[model samples]
Target: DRLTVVKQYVDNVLNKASDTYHGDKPSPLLADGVDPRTGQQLEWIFPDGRRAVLSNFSAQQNLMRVMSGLSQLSGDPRYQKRAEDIVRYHFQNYQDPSGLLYWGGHRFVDLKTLQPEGPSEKEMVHELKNAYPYYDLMFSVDSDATARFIRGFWNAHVYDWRILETSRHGEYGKPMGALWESKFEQQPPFFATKGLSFLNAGNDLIYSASLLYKHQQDQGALTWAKRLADQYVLPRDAKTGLGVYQFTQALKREEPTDDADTHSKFGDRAQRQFGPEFGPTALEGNMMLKGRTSTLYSENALMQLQLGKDLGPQGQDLLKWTVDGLKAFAKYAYNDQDNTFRPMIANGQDLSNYTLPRDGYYGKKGTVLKPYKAGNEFLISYARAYAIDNDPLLWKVARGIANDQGLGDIGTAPGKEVKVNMDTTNSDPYALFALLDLYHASQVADYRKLAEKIGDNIIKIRYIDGFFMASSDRQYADVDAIEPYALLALEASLRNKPQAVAPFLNGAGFTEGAYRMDDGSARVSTRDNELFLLNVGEKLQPN
Candidate 1:
């Protein structure tokens, strides 16, 4: 029954708003969102007052899975055909000469003009953060292109192969050179012009490369993946063995003269808050001064497990590294007395009991530290890892985190504090999926009951106005708001039916770009963009 309901919702979206721009020319991409009531494509307004219908393929990972799963469940080929047609068209038409696609956080296709679009500052730069793409479909649609895209991804992002100096942003149409054939060697770390090696972006790169090796037996891809994965491990604290959020050091910039200016001499905004000693080190500090261990451990652990599943015997090293990192955090960072984690510095010192000094980043002096509260991301990481390794410690951590979130005891209903607001939240599906993971791993019926409770809560709170909304007040449907595949996974588990797709564990996909309202055109060109000239250093040839 749940499956049927979810399928109907997807069916309505497919029939109405999926195929955007039905004028003289039709766009091959699906609109990022739509008005649930009217089934009309939703338009995004830029800061400059430009309006356009954007199709961010990166943001539609869940939708693609839902489409594919619904086709299998309903015995209807049309659903999958629709999904495949979009990918086929994108693969054939939207790729740059270097084999990179007009997708991910920095780039997207503007449906109104049928051209590429992105932020003017970061034009056509390839960046993937939390964008865990569905590479199976890509490989199936075009194996050759899929392989080249993965290679091109590494080629464009890696500014220096010796120290593994990488950038989150890669210029479009950057030449590949001999990247695939080059040997990887760990060199002494240095401060280079490359962007920070953020774990989120690095995770996607490794995941995609590992999948490429799995599909095509590309040894080069595997080599690069392992090498890149090692970069994060190198920065782990000697005492605590806890890993840093990023690998490379951010280049400190000149101080701003104006008080209103946000620029800092310490480089990263998060690092600037901590001053020099703590800021220059590679510790995670996106959340409060403490390391963002929630994302740091959860995302990396998930990627490692997925790589292990895909790589089999070859992935043992990856699993050991991840498990070690998890254990280190649990032992040194987690507080058993209160079930909270302390903010940690690079040297493994717990800052939960420390005070932050007044600085440019910290407006006030002597701020007392607060414990880092765990989220569903940590729950899923521990539960799923327990399933794979059968580590009792992992189970203990997961249960403790669950209890903190009002999910510790069976038959206990989670309160409004646990309710996920779709408008600004992405953790509702995570709770359901985490409970399901615990049930599957432990064979505990109570866990399934808890999952069902959370699932029902999600539908009641999130599904509104005949379609899923980010919140009750919002009447639009976006990929983040639509979670039919996750529901389908839970329903299949309850019915003892086979799952069509994996549950959506982490948020994936994003779009950024600029558009012209007056001309109704995107300010991006694949062949000869300004960013290519600025970064690649080649004069544009006259047509």
Candidate 2:
């Protein structure tokens, strides 16, 4: 019954949510979202009231998985075929001169014109956060294109290899000069540079390179992955071992003339908002300081450990660096007293006592200070790490986070109370992932049972009107909002088909943004976030 319900939604999507639904032309790209009531593609409205239909492949990972899973469960080849067609089409047409795919945070296909589009301010830049793509499928579709794209991704992002200076946003069509040939050059800690080394983007870069090496045996890709992974680790504080969130510092932009604008001041955003003493010490980007360490670094460390294991002996260094980094954070930054974590500064000073100033980007002044609370992402990361290392400390950290979230001893019987706040975009899937990981690691029956219970609850709460809504307030079904494949996996496990559906473990979500035209005017169009899944073509185990 559950499988049938999910298939109905998948069929609705295939019939209405894809470019082919328009019936004007055959295209493999799928719309980012659609209205289940009308079966019409959703439009992104511009500030000026113009609307453009968007097809962001990045946000379609789970949707693709659902379609592929449906095919495996129901003996329907067309479902999987449609998913493969989208991949093949993208590889054949959407590549830039540098072989970078025209899909990410800043760029996507405008379904109206069937052309590349993005936010006007950052049209040509590349960025990915938690977008662990399905490389196994990409290699299957076209190995050469997959390899070139991975290599080009690194090439476009690295501004200068000498100091390993990198940017979270890489320019498109950038020249791929002498790719992966230069030896990595390390620099001093918190070296001020033009690029911002946000770990969210860094994780995707490392993952792609590591996968490139895994699939094609590309030694250059492996070497570059190791070097880039080290860029984050090399700047750890000597005593506490807490690492800076970003390897390079953001260059101060010129102050804006408009006083009302948020960018009016010409100083480091963190420094300006938190005052100099506390600001300069801030470790993460200005936007990420709230969650601080757990926002980006926790997940980055998790990905490195995962890739490290995948790379075997070749990944030993990667594993060591990531483990040490996690240990340091647990030792110095994680607060055991309240089960909360302290955000650290570049110099490793604990920020537990500092309060936010009244006027700033966060739009609050004199907010009382509190330690960073662990979320589902942190729980998943800590659980997965424990699975690999078998560390009691890691398990303890994961359990504490879980308990705070009211998940109550995740290794045992995780609470089945379906909290309304646990949205499918991150909370619900993340909770399932944590339970699943713990089950695999410890062979504990309760963890698996809780995962199944939560998975069923997600379907009950989020799956509505033949679509998985991100929330009750949303009108349309977003492709990335639900993980029906996870449900399929749960059912398969119940029936002893452990590999019937591949797990959707990554925590990245689909993001969208608007861009400007060449004349410096805002375009009606916007870009949607990218999505990537692993084990795309693995055969489903028979029931």
Candidate 3:
């Protein structure tokens, strides 16, 4: 029954507003119909002002998935035909000198000439590696072409830890096997270089590598998965059996590096207060970093739970480590009185000790980093952990999260959108999945009712005019947000028998709200890869 709604949404997106670009020529420059600024259907204003039409590889990759799914399910050759057009146009124009497409992401184009505004930047290795799931999706249908894309783009971030410090002007580091790159900031010809690996980064690569190995038995991909498991997964705590993830390690670097007012955490600059996200502007952007002994949360640990089964013995071990760690944190990090879990907790000692330059009085002596109350992420992770292991403590933590957020009531889920950007998008889907798990675990009717309410709320917020818009503030249902949440929502409906999802595929995909007319152009965000959408496509296909 949910498949019916899923098919309709996919169809609406494909037929009304799939191809977002405006050009028709061989190179096919930017000609989006939707004006991002005015929210009207007019000739795509060429890249002018500060406004941008996101014509990066990620969005296009999702479009390919959508088109391919439509062709496979809707039984329409037009979808595949349109998708092929996208591939050909990109190859003709944006294909890098090295591969089928340029790794330089998020292009800024000039309006009059319809050319890039300044220099483009390559996304960091981890960032680039994480997109492989979508690339794999493309490979299923367009193998040779997708292979070219992966072959050219995949190796940019693979690096040896031994030489990592040699490149650093001030900082230092020792050896580790293969680790992913952190951030890629490019300007003109030459740009600054920085690299680090995070728990979540490795977590993403695990899925990508394992899936690729499953597809073609690529040993290199398997090797990567192991290397990541060895280096990225933090060891479990002996006492609590909980794992502690490194927030992010500095592959290299020392003094202030980024633009003008280089934000500082290490006392080489000055001991300070929490950033603005916590308190004030003084605290906003400047964040303290803790490598090795940093805290782990459901966000990263959940990755291991989700992909552990596919990774063989090593994956199982890593999954065990992650689950144990989650169990430990669930018991301690959550404050029952606050009805919130500490989003960030320290593993061992003072986070300030990592401050650079071996400076004096860096921060509070033996100061403990207090965790923040992030209701949605905490609940999602807690629920999944309980569902997977049936640990009583984990279930308790998950329910506590629901009660904290007032989700205890069946009729009302998240009352209104509290978060501004993707936080809301990222938070809600996992929460819904967690709710479903809670229902299954306890067979509680209210839990299912809560799940339904949350699902409806998510659909309500995202489905703008005739399209699944980006977030509360943005309009345009991004491929990234839509695919995952859509999959989960459909799964939620399916998991509970006899549940019927309302027909969500109205003209939402049409973009009448944003463009004021049926604009053929969809300015898709490059960050979304749409793996969930691909999963649904495969799920709906009968043997």
Candidate 4:
């Protein structure tokens, strides 16, 4: 029943945007193209009538994994066909000469003339990032995606890893994988760009290398991973036992001017541009995205530790770097007053402080990290670290993070966001997964109770049909975080409760997105702040 319902939801979106495909090739493989509410595209920087397709390479791998799972679960070849169809489209259109794919944004195709247009500079590191299985090897050892993984892991190349042009010194000295939003070149000299690392790209690259090692048993992958690990490590502080910044900022580069963009509107120090001849730089605004400092660093540390374990004795140095880094990060993140880990620990672009930047509602751009409520992402990070290390301190950190963020606040209306809007993207899933981690690690009834409260609350405000909303009480859905989190959340819930949430959890993991084209108006469209009631019940329910 769950599979059938979820498949219907998948088909419903597929059906809505099927018309946008070129001929029968499924041109716009995803659904949510135009705003379903008004049935229009958001805007067109291109001004072409062609519908722009949306996808993230790693996120696409995940959706394919889901399709592959459904194929086996439902005994339907069509599910695998769906996965193959999408894969074929991207591989054919986007894969570069190296057998790797690139990122997309302004690469709008004149779907009519078949001519490609850029804002071509939009491609970034994520295009080569990764995915899983019911026997799906979309990114496994022998696949074409594997080639990209191989090329990306070996080269440490961050394509279009650009952000707004930061500063002359920072940009010049910015490391190979650091963030600088402009037409990019490989940090000028092949030898080095100093040491600047952005979170998402760094996270994705490390994960890919780790998985590549997992898939091929290639020790060389670990070699590349270790090099990055060495570069990313920050010097541990003696007193706090934590590193000052999430990502390290040691430079073999020079500054164009001694006066850095420390207090500029250009954002954080991480994005500052410098040369390969710097003496030293401040640590503030060191990370490209410091949204969920607790979680992001924890994950980085976790992966490094895992890589270390895999390499046995050879990985001792790597292990120490991570352990030391993670310990410091966990200490810096925990807050005793609220009994939860802090969500936002610092600004992404500052030079010498931990002050929170006035960025936006939830986190750094694109909802990548959420420091919302003790931080579910951080909780999972700590719990996993504890599970691996058997460290008592990690358990305490995990337990503290598990405390309620006034989620229900008991007398509240469902799980309405009192202090901030619910992060339907990273936090919801991270929290759900974290709760599961805590439950299993501690076997405490309270953890389960708290998980139940969050799970119950999410269903009331965030759940629609089988999919989760982009935010609490909001109605759009996209790739990347939401599906992954929902899948894990439901999996965690089902693991603990078994038959109780099986019906809901099973289908909630399905992925969907909008397919849209501009008719030249550049009009902003919406499914509304949240979905209007007309989009509820029968409208949202799958066939």
User: What TM-score would candidate 3 get against the native?
Assistant: 0.60
- What's the lDDT for candidate 2? 0.67
| Clash count, candidate 3 | 21
Report each candidate's C-alpha RMSD, comma-separated, in the order given: 8.2, 7.5, 12.1, 10.2
Residue-pair clashes per candidate: 4, 9, 21, 40
lDDT of 3 by residue, 1-543 (tens): 333444555555443333344455323332222323333322222223234343344334444544455454445667566656655555565545444343222332322344442222221211332232344445545665554444433343334333221110111121222333334221221112243343433444455455566676777766656555544333333354434332133312455432223333331122233331122212111132322212245445555565565566756776776677676666655566666444332332223223232222224334554544546556666666665576767766665666556565322222222221212223265566666655665565656655666566655665544445444444234433344334434454454532222111100111110111124332333222221122211311211
- Clash pairs, candidate 1, are 58-509, 118-513, 118-514, 119-513
lDDT tens digits, residue span 1-543, model 4: 334544554554455434353666546555322344333322223334544443333333444555555555556768567667666665677555544443322233333333433432222222221122111345532364664534433343442333111111111112234212124322321122232344434544555565666666666555555544543453333355443333433343334243332433333343343211121232332332344354345556555655676778887887777666566555665554565444322321222223333232223323334333455555666666665566656655655554454322211111222222132222354566565655565454444555555555555555554354544433344422234334434443545443221111111111122222233333322221122222323232221
Candidate 2 residue-wise lDDT, 444-484, digit = tens: 67777677667877777777777776455555667655556
RMSD in Å for model 2: 7.5
Can you give the lDDT of residue 444 in candidate 4?
A: 48
Better of 3 and 4 by lDDT: 4
Question: Whole-model Cα lDDT per candidate?
Answer: 0.67, 0.67, 0.41, 0.42
RMSD of 3: 12.1
Off by over 4 Å in 2: 20-25, 46-49, 73-75, 251-268, 271-275, 278-288, 295-298, 335-339, 346-348, 358-369, 411-427, 495-543
- Candidate 2, residue 252: the lDDT equals 54
- Residue pairs clashing in model 2 are 58-530, 58-531, 119-514, 119-515, 120-515, 120-516, 133-532, 134-533, 358-365
- At residue 282, give the lDDT of candidate 2: 54
Which run of 10 residues does model 2 get worst, by summed lDDT?
Answer: 531-540
